[PDB]
Amino acid sequence: TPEEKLLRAIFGEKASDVKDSSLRVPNGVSGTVIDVQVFTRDGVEKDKRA
């Protein structure tokens, strides 16, 4: 929108091409993580934690 270009020009921050869509715990729920599995597409190279 106009004028957010204005604000960003007055402060000069980066319009990062990446948008946050990270899985978060739902609201109210408050537990403890007890197992974290990671699947992969076999063409994909595995990450660190996987």
Partner: protein, 473 residues
Amino acid sequence: EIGRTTDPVRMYMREMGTVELLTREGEIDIAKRIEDGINQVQCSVAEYPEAITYLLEQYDRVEAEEARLSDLITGFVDDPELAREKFAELRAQYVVTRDTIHATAQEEILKLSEVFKQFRLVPKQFDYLVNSMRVMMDRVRTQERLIMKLCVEQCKMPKKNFITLFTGNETSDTWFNAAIAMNKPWSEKLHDVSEEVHRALQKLQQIEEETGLTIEQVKDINRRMSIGEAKARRAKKEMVEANLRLVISIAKKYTNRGLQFLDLIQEGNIGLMKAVDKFEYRRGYKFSTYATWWIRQAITRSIADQARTIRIPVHMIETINKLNRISRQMLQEMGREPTPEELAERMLMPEDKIRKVLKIAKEPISMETPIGDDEDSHLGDFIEDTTLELPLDSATTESLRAATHDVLAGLTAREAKVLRMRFGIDMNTDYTLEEVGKQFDVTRERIRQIEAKALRKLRHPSRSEVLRSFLDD
């Protein structure tokens, strides 16, 4: 005899089960009849000298290094230049025939038809020139309507005698004009329509000019044309209405590709038409083997065309069908099922186009799919619009508008104007700094320093800290 039904496949099977199928050599005589129809049309073509000269014009044109001869002729019954020698023959024959301004004219026209109609002619050339002949028929019929309107229903001519002098003269100024002094109810009524009928006669005599043979013959040519056309269309109906059942068989071959039964039947039926118009009888060969590939390709192009609600081309559906064949082969030759980077050897594709092809193959879901447990909540009740904006977003945007408004209030006039012209604040599209210097008629670099100074002041603590508070980073 039957009660009723709706079931349009029912009415179709009914109406197609009237005709008996065929009898061998009956089909060959039907193809004989269709050859008779093309015969009469080509004959009526060749007996038209204007069409002959048109053909000659096109011939030289394509022979002038403008197109291949196939754009001229689909060959003759012979390398090329056979057409060139044939055109030399017909050129000499036509010049000798126009050298008879009634000594050898009709014998020459029969000779010209028998010297060019021997081998072949282009279908598209045929259509263009026959539509030209129908243009001549347009002028014929329009002259008819003009001279009938201007004679009988307008001022009460007797149409019997009206054509009775049309039969015999048809073009001059006595079969109409010598009527005008007949002293009848109409004869003393043709004096206000005299000029229009006069000019109409002039255009008919121009028809005589632009055709050669007599205007009655100019209508007789396309009359034989139409008669041959009926001769073809009749018994073409016989052939197709016979083999509709053949169509129905291979139509049933494809019943669950996402395209209803009668759609497949009609597609195969169009294929059957295209086969019959191209079918040869002289091959001494069975018709059904010729119609089968045609109907198959037609129906298959249909099912690749409009089966899915998202059209993918023939090549993608052929690749998909090959992958389905190769998987239904490989599941047992391996035992359980093939994985995408296993078909890299069974098929020779890049092993990622397989990925995208497997991605594309699925069909979309009906938005009223009954979701589980049989509640009436369908998938439609679960599709959110990710295009609307949150009202928190709207309030943020408008409050941001206000904040910048009262900030820019805290500046001069030229600074605020420069910042509403440089950024598109409360205005149309953002002005350029070139347009800046165009509207203030000023120094570019000094204006850039103006807005840098504005930015510097806007950096000020206790002056824009709420503004950076708008920055949610």
